Structure formats: structure tokens, C-alpha cells
From a paper:
Influenza neuraminidase (NA) is a glycoprotein present on the virion surface that facilitates nascent virus egress by cleaving sialosides from cell surface glycoproteins and glycolipids. NA is a type 2 integral membrane protein and forms a homotetramer, with each protomer containing a catalytic site that binds and hydrolyzes sialic acids. Here, we characterize human mAbs that target the highly conserved catalytic site of viral neuraminidase (NA), termed NCS mAbs, and the molecular basis of their broad specificity. Cryo-electron microscopy structures of two NCS mAbs revealed that they rely on structural mimicry of sialic acid, the substrate of NA, by coordinating not only amino acid side chains but also water molecules, enabling inhibition of NA activity across multiple influenza A and B viruses, including avian influenza clade 2.3.4.4b H5N1 viruses.
To explore how NCS.1.x mAbs recognize other subtype NA subtypes, we performed cryoEM analysis of NCS.1 in complex with an N5 NA (DB16), one of the probes used during initial B cell sorting. cryoEM 2D class averages and preliminary 3D reconstructions showed that NCS. Fabs formed stable complexes with recombinant N5 NA, with most N5 NA molecules bound by four Fabs and a subset bound by three. The 4.18 Å structure of the N5 protomer bound by three Fabs provided further insight into binding characteristics, revealing that NCS.1 binding induces minimal structural changes in the catalytic pocket, supporting a lock-and-key binding mode. Minor shifts in adjacent residues and consistent glycosylation patterns, with slight positional adjustments in glycan N146, allowed for precise binding without major conformational adjustments. In our N5–DB16 complex, which harbors a related G248S mutation, this rearrangement also displaces water molecules from the original binding site while preserving key interactions through alternative hydrogen bonding or van der Waals contacts. We additionally demonstrated that all NCS.1.x mAbs demonstrated ELLA inhibition activity against recombinant N5 DB16, confirming our ELISA binding data.
Author numbering:
A (entry chain A), D (entry chain P): 0 to 392
B (entry chain H): 1 to 117
C (entry chain L): 1 to 112
């Protein structure tokens, strides 16, 4: 039977670590794929770590120039939560260079975007097969949210964007039932940019905290429900949470207007935020100009009242370790026996040519946390790889 | 026509599309008689500009979003500056995590400029 | 700037036969972000240039299916599988890696 | 319960990619079998990629001289769709150097031919054990179709040939129930050659588009039903689709006669074609004298009326990448919930000594596509291996 999610999000006080891949550390000798961005989705029986393999193994000579992030070789694979992305346990899901997956209660749905830059299209797998295809409409890079989709009452939703990166794009909300699409509406959000949302369900309303890549230090917010009626805005919090940002004491914040800054207009990073009443568990990097470190801030009334009062702070990566994307997902009732959904989030750690020049490859390692009612301290659970690898020499 | 040592000015217009739509970089390109092409500079919808080093001291390029026009100014025009001038659009970006490049997909008709008395 | 050279100055061809043009650059055009920024442009008599190939291999929209491209590092090649009467013109290669973009010398295609 | 297939083939407008092995690219460091020709068959629960391993791993020195395509070390193995042919997921199916497999609803049936050249015989596995053996009758190389067999109402069919390669052979149609054979009829096709058919069911009639190796540029057609009454002919299409062929404007075509050409008489390649009313989705290589590139052509009335009007064309490999065999298979109702069968086809990509002289080995990588009602663009999903490998140095 289909998986319900019309139940409220759980109030949590601190996040406790759940699993850690050790993907790069083991990969020095073991056969492990080269990943760029992973994410986690939970079905009724088990949670699985999806990732976009680059078609080559670490230390393999095919890892040359893996910084290239769109190629015909990329594929979305799947491994049970915690296990390294090794070559012999990874179940194949779809071909893609941008994807999303979620479990609707019966079988996995997975969306995989492929094709040329200007003529991309998306293939919607359901249970192992393609059932439908969605083509671009503005004929630029088509993109999905790089994290789990949200399924409620058997219908799974996700957000796609097509258009320029550093300028106003066209965003659409999709709705599907048993693989094939059934509804589609466009977001008329003139003043901002919504690229790489992270979504979770909350009492029948899908909420997404997204990435602003155009004249914005602030997280966009999208809220929609069964029949795709939506509200669009910005995370009111007075504490900025995008990677390029001015220090907290200089920022002002706004609920509806985008807020630019000094050199922070044309860049950003995927993030997440959980609403708790009117507060928000906004996650952000420690550094204000680079993807390093990571924090979780519980901002009182940060969802609606431009507040700056940080009630609680937790650090999971100290400032000297590289970080990356971060996304949200929820563990459903069928797996907890709770009467509410337990929030969780995942955090990747990039290592490679983008910041470590000498290496020829680029991979990342995933870490997963979940909320806990009891308060929990933090620690620097860094990846711990030791570069350069044998192939870089 | 332009006399030597004067200042050259040119105008280019956009239609169908609107400046500040699609996030393109607008470019000026030159072609001397019997020679290959040469690249002058770029302007983004928000006014950020790039120049070719050899002409950086003479050039000035700007936009007027209300008129859907962008302009090229070249000071101290020499006789060698005689050439056909094209204006084109090119949509590319290097910051984001999903870069793309669609080089010079649209060109306007050339304007012949002769720098002589 | 990237010094760009083109192999044939003039290429005699005839309809129905394959044809090939090549370009070499003074520095590898493999940008740090992994993409190879090189294009091919075609200027027919009495017209402004047109877009053929906008990366090392990608064809542009509307271009005839007869064109192709390949190459990496410093050496690149444009392939015409079946030359036709409409292909007479001057072919320019371009690179968009550095701040000053530079074009090639220009290979003229003459039918014989 | 046995798997029905007495339902019509589904009308499709374009083929969207489903999976890609990346076998060779991963094999540079991972432990992967050396394949020569793969194929795909779909059961009620999952689809699997079968392949005839050569008994050695890539980069292993035993890969010496793997061009030899019949030796006492080949074996038909099986992997779930999409996963690379690695050494440790691979289930073992049968010994063979020529095989076919299909799922009849209860358990996998698999046929494996083995033995010396002049006294070969076939073993019919059913559910992991042998039940019956079929011996040669003309005492030359015995061959099965190198692609999935067609099961209807519990009876599984396949085509075998024995005799010369460049001359008239003897062809037979087999029918089996729960492993053991029950019926057998010979095809009295005097004027042509039918070697390596690709078959799919269509509303109770098994249809096969085969390979002509003797005075033929044109695809032979075989149609038979429950009790093995058959019709034999040629694909009427005016567009030739065998590898050696004259250009399309020189060809004329015929429905019943073989059509030779200039130097195209004694060679060919396995292919496939789906009937859509009176049109055909004939697949063929891009080049007219080599196995490179790949196209899919929807020829209006090409099945019966010698037409040349190509309504739609799709390219999945550009002309600069090597290609190879191609075969058909259908995803049944039990796995789609549709009231019709969804056509699909697979395409291998050979790399090795046959065309790349310096390498000592020979392997191929599989790519799978499936039909979609919506129109879909194409792209060059090439294998992307980087030869020579470390063992060739
Ligand atoms: C792929 O990774 C390999 C290393 O695994 C890199 O190989 C290097 O490629 C460069 C050219 O891109 C070679 O440089 C050339 O070498 C010779 C002297 O050996 C000389 O004629 C030239 O002046 C030029 O420098 C280099 O030798 C080669 N190997 C090493 C160890 O550096 C390669 O650059 C990476 N990228 C690609 C696209 O293959
Ligand atoms: C199998 O693959 C191996 C390489 O992995 C090939 O080995 C080569 O075998 C040839 C003979 O077939 C050797 O050539 C002979 O070598 C000596 C000098 O070393 C000389 O006495 C002879 O004139 C003759 O050339 C060759 O050295 C050997 N190694 C290499 C690196 O080529 C082998 O040919 C492949 N085939 C078989 C059937 O094993
Ligand atoms: C889903 O929600 C409906 C409506 O509240 C309820 O009747 C049904 O039992 C729920 N199903 C499950 C599996 O929890
Ligand atoms: C197979 O077909 C028969 C005859 O049409 C039908 O009665 C039966 O229900 C079908 N079985 C399945 C499993 O679809
Ligand atoms: Ca930003
Ligand atoms: Ca033939």
C-alpha cells in the first residue's frame, strides 16, 4: 500500500550521526566509484545512498578530468545506507547527470536527466524501467533537485529548472503517479532564482529550501500541496546561510525580496532548512567565502520574523575540512513507529582538483545525521583521506 | 565615415528577445578587409565588461536596457581600424556547478566603417 | 593570447566526397572546469559568420546533420561527411578559454 | 503462472536510453569479464543482461587472443540490468559459445551450444539444471539466435541454424515446454540465408528480423505461430539495413527476392526491426561498409511496400564510434501494467583487436533503450574507453 506522509514534522533538539561512507579512504585500494554529489532517500524497509557515478574507479586512469560534471557516462547508482559506493554492491538505477529518487510505498521512482546541453530530456524510471519522458522547454540545461523527491498519498513531487544559471530561469513543479506524469505548473518567481531545492513533507504541505544563484545571499522558500497551489518567498532569517555571504552583523534580511551583497551575487551552494514551528534548523558552511566547515543553527522565529537570536549551534566539521552540498530527507512512520516524521540531513565532503590542485580526480564522501529529541554535542567527523593518491603521482 | 583621429561610435539593437533576458553576453567582433576575425569585448546584462588588451585603452562599451540597445565607442580611430563591425550574442557561464557555453549563436548584419578623409 | 593556426589555407573539394579541416592551438584548450572551449564558424560569400560546432564535438541547432567534430588538447578537427554545393565558404576556428578570444587564419573551401 | 504474451506490440514514437554498462571503462581496474556479444531478456520481476564470457578478466594475461570466438572456456553468465559484468555479481547460467535465454513466467530457460566444430550439440537448461539435448543434423557449426527467445502461453520458441556460413544452410524452428523440446519444423527457404534472428512476440505471432550472409543486403523475415506454421520473406523496405550495402539512392529492394550488391554478398551484422502497423523501426549502422555509428529509421510502409520515405530518424552513436550487434526484446505486461508490450532494443559496442590492431583482447559494452510514446531526441552515448590498457603495453 502507498506510503502516507500527511503527518507533522518532529520537533528535535540535536542531530546525532547515523552513518559515514569512508568512500575515499577505503577507495585507496578498494574498487570504489568516483562520485560528485550523493544523496539519501528512505523507503519503508531501508534507506539507500544514491549517487551519480562518473563511470570510473578511484586510482583508475579513467578518472582523468572528472571535474567535467556532464558527460554521457554518468549514471545514478544505489547502495544501502552506510556501505561505501563500491563497484560490486551498487545497484544500477538510471542514466543521468542530474537525478532525484524517492520511494512511494510500492517501488522506487527515479528521474534521470541525460542528453546534450541544449536538448536534454528526463527519463522517469519506476521499478526498473522507463515509463515517461519530459523534454526541455527553454532548451538550456535541464535540472532536477539533487536530493530525494517527496511522495504523499502515492503522488511524488519534484522541482525542475531550465534556463540560464546567473539569470532568471523558468521553474516548474511536477507531480507523478505510478511513474508517469500527471500535472505541471510553472513558478512565476520574477525576483529570484530557484535551482537545487531540498524538499521534505510537512503535514500535507511539501516545503523546499533552495539555492539562490542570482543576486541572493538568502535561501528561497517554496511551499506547495496536493494540487500544486504554491507560495514563493525567502527564508526570513536574519542570519544568511548561502556560502558567499557577508558576516552576520552586516546582514539585514527580508522575507520577500532578494538580498545581494559584495561579490556574493553569482554563486551559491545547495543547502537545507527544517521548520520547527516558527524557528528553523538552518544549515550553513562555517566559512563565509568557501565550502569548508559546517554548522546547524536553530534560529528562533527565523522562518517568519527576520530574527537573529541563535538558540542552539552544532558543528559537525571544523573550519579546516572541505565540505559541500547538503540536503534533507525524512524517515517515515513505517520505519519508526512514531506518529510523526523524523527529520534528517546529509552532508558531502568534496576532495579533488577544485581546491586541491595537484590531484587529477574529484570525489566526495557522504555523512548522515538524524534528529534526536535529546540534546546532542558535535564533533569534527571529517573525511580523513590522505592525498595525493597513487594515480596522482 | 570617420576621419582619422576622431572617435568612432556604433549602435546595435535587440528585438524578439529583451536585454536582461536569457543572461547573454553581448559581443563586438571585427573583420579587416581580406583578414580573419578579431574579438573586441563583452558586456553582461548587468554591466560587467571585458576588453581585448590591445584595445582596452581606446574602448568603451555600455548598455541601455530601456532602449534594448548596446553601444561601442572607440577613441582615436586610426586608418587601420577600417573593418566590418558585427554585434553578436553568446550565452555562457563559468561560476555555477553546471557550466554551459553556446558560442555566438546569433549575428547581426555587418556595418562597414572606413576611417579616411 | 592563444596563437591559432589552421592547416589548409585553401582546400579543394568536390560534391559528394568527404572533406577534412584541422586546427592547432599554442596551448591546450582544456579549461580547469573540464570543458574544452573551441568552436567552428562558417562564413559564406556576402554574409556574416554562422555557428557550426560550439564545443569540441557538439553540433549547434539547425546545422545540417553532415558535420562532425573531434579532438582534444591542442589538436582538433572538423569533418564533412558529404560535401554539398552549399558548403562553399571560409571556415574559422575559435577558442573561448582565455579572456581575449582569438580566431583562426581561415580555411577557404573551393569546389573543383 | 505462465507469462502471457498474446498482446499487441505498442506503438512508439522515440527511444529513450535505459541503462549503460560502462563495462570496459570500469574494467580498467575492476574485475570484469571479457565479453564478445551480450543481450537482454526480461522476466516478470527484473530484466537481466546475459553475456558469453570468454573465461578471463580484462587486463589478465589470459585475455591473449580472445578474438577466437569458439573455445572450451566460454560460458553464458547473467547480471541484473545495468550492472557491469563484474566477476562477483555474475550468476552462472550455462556453458556455451552460442546461447539464448528467456523467462517463461516460472523460471529462466537457457540454451547453450558447446562442443567441437563439426559435432556440436545444445544443452537446454531450465531452472538451473539440464533437461534435454539437441544434436546437430548437418554436422557443421550449430547456432542459436544470439538474443532472447520468445515465450507465449508457456511455450518458448527459438531459431537454430546448421550448415555453411557463405552458402545455403539448413534452418529449423524449435518449440519447448518446461525445458524439454516438443516440436520442430524446418524452414524451406531456398533463396536466402537466416543466421542470427532477433525475435519478439506480436499478438500471438512470433516475428523475427534476421541476418543475411549470402547474396543479401536485406533483412530476412520469419513469422510463425503456436503450431509452427511459418511465412518467410524479406523486409520490403527500400532502405537497405545490413552493414555492407550500397547507398540508399542506388538500392531498389524486394519483398521476396534477395538483393545482392557490389562486394556486399558474403558479410553482414545482426540487427533488428519492430513492425508498427505497416511501418518499421529498422535499425542500422551509420556507415555503409563498417560497424560504426547507429541509427533508428521509421520507414513508412517499409514492411510491405518497398517505400523509402523516412518519417523519423534518431542517432545514438555518431559515426566515429565503433558499434556491433543489435537485438530486440519486449517488457511484458506484468512489469508495466500496460495492456500492450513495450518494445526495446540493445546495442553493443565492440573494442579490441578486430579494428584496433594494437590491443591483444576484444570486449564489448552494452547499451539499452526502450520505446516511449513521446518523441525523444538522440545523442552519442559512446563507450568512452581509453585504449591501450595496461596489459597491451
Ligand atoms: C590525464 O592525466 C595524465 C596523467 O595521468 C596527464 O598526462 C600528461 O599529459 C601531458 C599533456 O597534457 C603530457 O605533457 C606532454 O609531455 C611531453 C613530455 O613527456 C612533452 O612533449 C610536452 O611538452 C607535454 O608537456 C605529460 O607528459 C603527461 N604525463 C604527465 C605525467 O604529466 C594528462 O595531462 C591528463 N589530461 C588528459 C587530458 O589526458
Ligand atoms: C600473447 O600476448 C603476449 C603479450 O602479452 C605476446 O607475447 C609475445 O610473443 C611473441 C611470440 O609470439 C614474442 O616474440 C618473440 O620474442 C623473442 C624476443 O623476446 C624472439 O626470440 C622472437 O623473435 C620473437 O619475436 C614476444 O617477445 C612476446 N612478448 C611481447 C611483449 O611481444 C604473444 O605474442 C601473444 N600471443 C600468444 C599466442 O601468446
Ligand atoms: C493513510 O492515511 C489515511 C487517512 O488518514 C488512513 O486512513 C490510512 O490508514 C493511512 N495508511 C497508512 C498505511 O498509514
Ligand atoms: C492470459 O491470457 C488468458 C487468455 O486471454 C487470460 O484468461 C489470462 O487471465 C491471462 N493471464 C495473465 C496472467 O494475464
Ligand atoms: Ca547565492
Ligand atoms: Ca548481408
Amino acid at each position: 500500500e502507498f506510503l502516507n506522509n500527511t503527518e507533522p514534522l518532529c520537533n528535535v533538539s540535536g542531530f546525532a550521526i547515523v552513518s559515514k561512507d569512508n568512500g575515499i579512504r577505503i577507495g585507496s585500494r578498494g574498487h570504489v566509484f568516483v562520485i560528485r554529489e550523493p544523496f539519501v532517500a528512505c523507503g519503508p524497509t531501508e534507506c539507500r545512498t544514491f549517487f551519480l557515478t562518473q563511470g570510473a574507479l578511484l586510482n583508475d586512469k579513467h578518472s582523468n578530468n572528472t571535474v567535467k560534471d556532464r558527460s554521457p557516462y554518468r549514471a545514478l547508482m544505489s547502495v544501502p545506507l552506510g556501505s561505501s559506493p563500491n563497484a560490486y554492491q551498487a545497484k544500477f538505477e538510471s542514466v543521468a547527470w542530474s537525478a532525484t529518487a524517492c520511494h512511494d510505498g510500492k517501488r522506487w521512482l527515479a528521474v534521470g536527466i541525460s542528453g546534450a546541453d541544449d536538448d536534454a530530456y528526463a527519463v522517469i524510471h519506476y521499478g526498473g524501467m522507463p515509463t515517461d519522458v519530459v523534454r526541455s522547454w527553454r532548451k538550456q540545461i535541464l535540472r532536477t533537485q539533487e536530493s530525494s523527491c517527496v511522495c504523499m498519498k502515492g503522488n511524488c513531487y519534484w522541482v525542475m529548472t531550465d534556463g540560464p544559471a546567473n539569470s532568471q530561469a523558468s521553474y516548474k513543479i511536477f507531480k507523478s503517479h505510478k511513474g508517469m506524469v500527471t500535472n505541471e505548473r510553472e513558478v512565476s518567481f520574477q525576483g529570484g532564482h530557484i535551482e537545487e531545492c531540498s524538499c521534505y513533507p510537512n503535514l500535507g504541505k511539501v516545503e523546499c529550501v533552495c539555492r539562490d544563484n542570482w543576486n541572493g545571499m538568502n535561501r528561497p522558500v517554496l511551499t506547495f500541496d496536493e494540487d500544486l497551489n504554491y507560495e514563493v518567498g525567502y527564508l526570513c532569517a536574519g542570519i544568511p546561510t548561502d556560502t558567499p555571504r557577508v558576516q552576520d552583523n552586516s546582514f539585514i534580511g527580508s522575507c520577500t525580496n532578494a538580498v545581494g551583497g559584495s561579490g556574493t551575487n553569482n554563486y551559491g551552494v545547495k543547502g537545507f532548512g527544517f521548520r520547527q514551528g516558527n524557528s528553523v534548523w538552518a544549515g550553513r558552511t562555517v566559512s563565509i567565502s568557501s565550502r569548508s566547515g559546517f554548522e546547524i543553527l536553530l534560529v528562533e522565529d527565523g522562518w517568519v520574523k527576520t530574527s537573529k537570536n541563535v538558540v542552539k549551534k552544532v558543528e559537525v566539521l571544523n573550519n579546516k575540512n572541505w565540505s559541500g552540498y547538503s540536503g534533507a530527507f525524512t524517515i517515515p512512520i513505517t520505519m519508526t513507529s512514531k506518529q510523526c516524521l523524523v527529520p534528517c540531513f546529509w552532508l558531502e565532503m568534496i576532495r579533488g582538483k577544485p581546491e586541491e590542485r595537484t590531484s587529477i580526480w574529484t570525489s566526495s564522501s557522504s555523512t548522515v545525521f538524524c534528529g534526536v529529541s535529546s540534546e546532542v554535542p558535535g564533533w569534527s567527523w571529517d573525511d580523513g583521506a590522505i592525498l595525493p593518491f597513487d594515480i596522482d603521482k | 565615415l570617420v576621419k582619422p583621429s576622431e572617435t568612432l561610435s556604433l549602435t546595435c539593437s535587440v528585438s524578439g528577445e529583451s536585454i536582461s533576458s536569457g543572461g547573454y553576453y553581448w559581443t563586438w567582433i571585427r573583420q579587416h578587409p581580406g583578414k580573419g576575425l578579431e574579438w573586441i569585448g563583452n558586456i553582461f546584462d548587468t554591466g560587467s565588461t571585458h576588453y581585448s588588451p590591445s584595445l582596452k585603452t581606446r574602448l568603451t562599451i555600455s548598455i541601455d536596457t530601456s532602449k534594448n540597445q548596446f553601444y561601442l565607442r572607440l577613441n582615436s580611430a586610426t586608418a587601420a581600424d577600417t573593418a566590418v563591425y558585427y554585434c553578436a550574442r553568446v550565452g555562457y557561464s563559468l561560476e555555477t556547478d553546471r557550466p554551459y557555453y553556446f558560442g555566438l549563436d546569433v549575428w547581426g548584419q555587418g556595418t562597414t566603417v572606413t576611417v579616411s578623409s | 593570447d592563444i596563437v591559432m593556426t589552421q592547416s589548409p589555407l585553401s582546400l579543394p573539394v568536390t560534391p559528394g566526397e568527404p572533406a577534412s579541416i584541422s586546427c592547432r592551438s599554442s596551448q591546450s584548450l582544456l579549461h580547469s572546469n573540464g570543458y574544452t572551449y573551441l568552436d567552428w564558424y562558417l562564413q559564406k560569400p556576402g554574409q556574416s559568420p554562422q555557428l557550426l560546432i560550439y564545443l569540441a564535438s557538439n553540433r549547434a541547432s539547425g546545422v545540417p546533420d553532415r558535420f562532425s567534430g573531434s579532438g582534444s588538447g591542442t589538436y582538433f578537427t572538423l569533418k564533412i561527411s558529404r560535401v554539398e554545393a552549399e558548403d562553399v565558404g571560409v571556415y574559422y576556428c575559435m577558442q573561448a578559454v582565455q579572456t581575449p578570444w582569438t580566431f583562426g587564419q581561415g580555411t577557404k573551401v573551393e569546389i573543383k
